[PDB]
Amino acid sequence: NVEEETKYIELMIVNDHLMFKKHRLSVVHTNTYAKSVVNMADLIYKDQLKTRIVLVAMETWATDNKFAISENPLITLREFMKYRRDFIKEKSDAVHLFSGSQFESSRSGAAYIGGICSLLKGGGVNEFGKTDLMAVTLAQSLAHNIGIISDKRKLASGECKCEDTWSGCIMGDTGYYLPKKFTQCNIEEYHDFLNSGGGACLFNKPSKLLDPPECGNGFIETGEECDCGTPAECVLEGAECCKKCTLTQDSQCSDGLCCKKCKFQPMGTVCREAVNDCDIRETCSGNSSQCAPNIHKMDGYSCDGVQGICFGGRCKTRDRQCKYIWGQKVTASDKYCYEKLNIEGTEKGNCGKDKDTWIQCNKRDVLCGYLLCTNIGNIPRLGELDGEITSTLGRTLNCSGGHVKLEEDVDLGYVEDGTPCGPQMMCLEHRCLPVASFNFSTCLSSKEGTICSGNGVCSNELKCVCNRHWIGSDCNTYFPHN
Amino acid sequence: DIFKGLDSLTNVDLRGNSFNCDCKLKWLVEWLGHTNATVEDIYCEGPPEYKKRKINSLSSKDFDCIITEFAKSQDLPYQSLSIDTFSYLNDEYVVIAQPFTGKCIFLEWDHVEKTFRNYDNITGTSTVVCKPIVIE
């Protein structure tokens, strides 16, 4: 399935001048050092995650640091990410900073949780360290970016623990003696993230790498007509397709799901079933060995008739917010709490985060104020509590809320932006606002007030993907075919 | 011990011949404790510990070369990280931390067969160190 498919995370490394000076000002040494670290992290990820981290590019500042460098991991991470947004433009799934400034914190590297495949969130910062040390830090940070984090609630409950009890696991504080195995909850979080639609940009094979043309490296690069890998593992997959980076008499493929038994599969086959309603099934082009590019519902499309919205391919509901923030057993409360707590109250219902004078929420809409769920546990899966978890009690409901934080300034305790409040009514700056606030673009439509001429759904690339037997770009002409 | 290769001999002459009286040459002094044949001793100019005297008058204790080597007695199969020893109850105990086991092991020397005897163990998850200190 989609999980079993080989993910390809396009990573680019940004390097500051501190470790450049520490490496005797040598460009080539830093380049090969980054290549070795990338290879080591890929070897880590290949055992379980089945994900190859392709070092698409790397930048090292031989001159000096462009922006302010501080020992605070959060401030330095923000500066690196804003520098990436301002200057870095090349397509890359993850943008990771090797921080020469060794952070004065207790955590090795600072990476956003579930932030991969994002312009302002796709990557993290890894501090200076030993080759293995920063390789482990990069592995932890990339696990963070793909939503793989140590589960605090399961740690307290003992639901899942590190099977490498010798020296702990990678997700925890980086001990000197590195382990070799990830926990099963790491992989479970990976399936949950991929099924949610996150990390959809990791399914592309780059054609250009920092590595010279190497036969059997697992990627069809420049100068290689086909690549089935080393013949040791080529027997299982693509045995007759490609041999020694060369075709076997009459052939059309090397690997890939869209090409079964080294031959082209029939047209219309689904090489990737949609994970949810936010995902769009991918069909092979009929002449491309690799599966179709990942396409999801455009940002603003609802998971259901009214409730829920797909952002970046990930569904968002109040119930989904409670599940991500608090836990699976925790579900969003009814409108009763929303209209009985957000209207007036301290620490119970608040629109904006103001400890002194809490922001009042109007009765027109109360679905963007304090996030209220049902049966909130002792501790959330991720984040921290700003004080104590708020608890509030003809129908009786167990009403609860909190102020779950994160490594970013954004507060997960409130309702995340874009959560629906009604018809085209979704959160923006802790308030229900229409689509005009977000200024969502209109896809290729021919009628009035429709999407892709009514029948058809626009993908994430703002391009229409018409339905069956609709070859027109704007879903206007019918072309029967067999 | 080149001298003893020959069996029969009555005269050996040492006159005006330099030497370096060290531990390796010490055998000669030891051989000079067994020699019987007509021999005249000459001066030896090696280390400054030896002055202008006769080698036959030397003693094997002037050369203080104590040969020290190590004999293998591998008996403990368990892995180890920290090995630390400490004198206690007139028996210097050796304490060993075993990796991947969380086992801290105590060994005491005994003269029954010239080895160390295991007598105690500790509970743990994965031992790294077992620093022993005896106070009061």
Side-chain angles (χ1 to χ4, degrees):
Chain A
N1 49 1
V2 54
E3 314 285 338
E4 204 178 1
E5 284 179 355
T6 304
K7 277 76 56 177
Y8 295 100
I9 290 187
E10 309 202 0
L11 169 65
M12 183 278 288
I13 293 310
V14 188
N15 290 318
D16 48 343
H17 191 32
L18 262 190
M19 293 182 286
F20 193 73
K21 177 176 283 187
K22 261 56 174 181
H23 297 124
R24 298 285 74 77
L25 280 299
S26 169
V27 176
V28 181
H29 169 243
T30 50
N31 305 353
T32 313
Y33 180 74
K35 295 157 196 145
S36 51
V37 170
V38 159
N39 290 294
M40 182 46 227
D42 178 32
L43 292 164
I44 285 175
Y45 276 32
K46 180 257 292 179
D47 296 332
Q48 313 158 75
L49 276 183
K50 201 80 174 178
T51 299
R52 317 279 313 275
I53 308 161
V54 171
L55 183 56
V56 292
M58 173 303 288
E59 63 184 2
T60 303
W61 293 98
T63 297
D64 198 76
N65 290 318
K66 298 293 183 182
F67 48 80
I69 319 293
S70 162
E71 57 269 12
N72 194 310
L74 313 179
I75 295 175
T76 317
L77 170 63
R78 194 195 78 189
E79 291 289 293
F80 155 69
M81 262 315 317
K82 65 96 177 179
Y83 187 81
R84 176 255 194 277
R85 172 211 73 196
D86 291 332
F87 291 83
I88 291 158
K89 190 52 191 67
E90 57 95 20
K91 176 256 294 180
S92 62
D93 306 346
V95 186
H96 263 297
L97 182 75
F98 289 167
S99 165
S101 57
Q102 200 277 339
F103 300 136
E104 293 324 308
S105 61
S106 65
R107 160 178 176 141
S108 66
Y112 313 99
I113 300 173
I116 210 160
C117 292
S118 163
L119 178 66
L120 268 298
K121 219 174 166 184
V125 289
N126 309 272
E127 74 176 20
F128 152 78
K130 285 289 286 288
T131 301
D132 43 353
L133 170 58
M134 50 163 97
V136 159
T137 310
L138 187 152
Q140 171 206 6
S141 281
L142 263 180
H144 263 274
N145 287 133
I146 66 181
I148 287 181
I149 50 175
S150 185
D151 206 357
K152 182 67 179 69
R153 54 151 281 187
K154 292 198 186 182
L155 272 177
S157 167
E159 194 167 1
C160 66
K161 209 172 65 63
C162 180
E163 71 171 350
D164 203 331
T165 65
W166 151 246
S167 281
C169 274
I170 315 190
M171 305 71 81
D173 291 320
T174 307
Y176 175 65
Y177 309 91
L178 59 92
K180 184 174 71 68
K181 301 171 291 297
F182 283 122
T183 54
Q184 70 275 17
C185 294
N186 300 162
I187 323 296
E188 293 304 318
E189 282 161 73
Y190 198 59
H191 325 97
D192 299 359
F193 202 75
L194 273 187
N195 278 321
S196 83
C201 73
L202 324 176
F203 282 78
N204 58 5
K205 175 178 285 185
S207 190
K208 282 189 179 309
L209 279 82
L210 299 199
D211 185 73
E214 163 201 5
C215 182
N217 60 338
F219 323 103
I220 297 89
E221 309 187 5
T222 56
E224 317 161 332
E225 63 273 16
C226 62
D227 207 5
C228 84
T230 317
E233 69 267 4
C234 189
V235 192
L236 300 180
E237 192 193 32
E240 296 102 5
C241 309
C242 185
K243 177 175 70 68
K244 293 177 184 176
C245 299
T246 61
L247 280 73
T248 56
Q249 199 179 341
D250 184 49
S251 283
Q252 291 163 350
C253 312
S254 61
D255 281 321
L257 263 71
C258 289
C259 195
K260 61 97 177 178
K261 300 201 279 285
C262 300
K263 312 299 147 197
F264 281 164
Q265 74 189 15
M267 191 65 198
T269 42
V270 190
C271 56
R272 205 177 306 111
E273 188 42 70
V275 287
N276 54 358
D277 293 329
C278 302
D279 195 11
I280 293 160
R281 75 279 190 192
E282 279 87 12
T283 71
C284 314
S285 288
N287 50 4
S288 181
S289 298
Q290 195 172 3
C291 179
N294 259 337
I295 53 173
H296 285 242
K297 290 219 294 190
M298 182 285 258
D299 295 331
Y301 290 8
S302 190
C303 302
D304 282 329
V306 169
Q307 287 318 303
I309 284 175
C310 305
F311 285 116
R314 310 189 64 213
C315 191
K316 172 184 286 184
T317 65
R318 268 165 297 273
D319 171 72
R320 284 313 288 279
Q321 279 189 15
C322 296
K323 285 207 196 292
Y324 194 11
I325 284 148
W326 301 111
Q328 323 92 38
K329 82 165 189 66
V330 193
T331 192
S333 86
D334 207 47
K335 181 263 290 180
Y336 192 87
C337 275
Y338 284 93
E339 284 188 353
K340 269 215 166 58
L341 277 188
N342 280 299
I343 176 68
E344 277 294 328
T346 185
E347 200 66 19
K348 303 180 188 297
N350 314 300
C351 275
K353 180 67 176 178
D354 296 75
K355 298 296 291 183
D356 172 57
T357 50
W358 296 105
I359 301 299
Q360 195 266 334
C361 306
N362 47 4
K363 197 56 70 69
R364 173 92 264 175
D365 275 322
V366 288
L367 297 188
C368 283
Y370 211 82
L371 179 76
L372 296 173
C373 315
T374 302
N375 207 344
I376 281 176
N378 196 1
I379 51 166
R381 277 189 78 260
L382 74 164
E384 208 262 338
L385 304 178
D386 191 8
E388 281 291 333
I389 278 170
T390 301
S391 306
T392 304
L393 272 298
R395 202 68 182 90
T396 60
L397 297 166
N398 209 351
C399 193
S400 44
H403 279 284
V404 174
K405 281 283 202 70
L406 208 52
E407 82 171 10
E408 267 285 326
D409 291 282
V410 62
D411 203 305
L412 278 167
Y414 291 165
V415 188
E416 303 152 35
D417 272 9
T419 296
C421 304
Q424 320 294 329
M425 192 36 48
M426 61 205 158
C427 290
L428 195 147
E429 209 193 5
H430 306 343
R431 200 187 303 118
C432 305
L433 291 187
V435 290
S437 65
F438 284 95
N439 302 290
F440 291 165
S441 315
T442 71
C443 196
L444 276 77
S445 177
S446 70
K447 276 101 163 179
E448 190 277 331
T450 57
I451 54 170
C452 299
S453 311
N455 45 1
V457 63
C458 196
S459 66
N460 54 324
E461 65 183 1
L462 205 64
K463 299 306 288 190
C464 290
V465 185
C466 292
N467 301 116
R468 182 179 62 84
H469 280 86
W470 283 85
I471 317 297
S473 161
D474 60 357
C475 300
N476 81 307
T477 51
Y478 197 94
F479 180 78
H481 45 272
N482 202 354
Chain B
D1 311 331
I2 177 177
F3 188 99
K4 275 79 68 175
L6 166 61
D7 306 352
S8 313
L9 179 139
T10 75
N11 189 46
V12 167
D13 291 331
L14 273 298
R15 280 189 285 259
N17 199 358
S18 192
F19 286 106
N20 302 152
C21 289
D22 67 320
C23 316
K24 187 265 287 182
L25 184 62
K26 169 216 283 184
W27 75 265
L28 165 66
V29 180
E30 301 170 328
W31 175 242
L32 285 173
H34 291 281
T35 184
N36 287 330
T38 81
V39 285
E40 202 282 324
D41 213 356
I42 196 65
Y43 293 359
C44 172
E45 284 82 7
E49 56 90 18
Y50 184 79
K51 267 69 56 182
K52 312 272 192 176
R53 58 185 185 265
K54 289 325 168 167
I55 296 96
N56 57 6
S57 305
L58 268 170
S59 292
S60 45
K61 307 316 144 198
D62 289 4
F63 319 96
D64 286 319
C65 286
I66 295 181
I67 297 103
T68 56
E69 65 264 14
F70 280 80
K72 51 189 185 295
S73 49
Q74 168 93 65
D75 54 346
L76 266 295
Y78 302 106
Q79 293 171 344
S80 165
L81 294 174
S82 78
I83 297 190
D84 202 350
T85 72
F86 72 116
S87 191
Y88 192 29
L89 316 170
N90 192 0
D91 209 298
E92 41 184 3
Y93 309 123
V94 187
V95 181
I96 297 89
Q98 187 178 159
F100 311 104
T101 66
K103 188 52 69 72
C104 194
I105 308 97
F106 305 88
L107 274 287
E108 54 195 0
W109 163 270
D110 43 358
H111 310 78
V112 187
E113 63 268 358
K114 300 289 186 180
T115 189
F116 312 94
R117 161 190 56 233
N118 180 14
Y119 65 100
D120 265 327
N121 285 266
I122 311 295
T123 315
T125 72
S126 285
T127 61
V128 290
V129 71
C130 275
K131 282 305 288 286
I133 46 168
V134 159
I135 298 89
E136 293 104 13

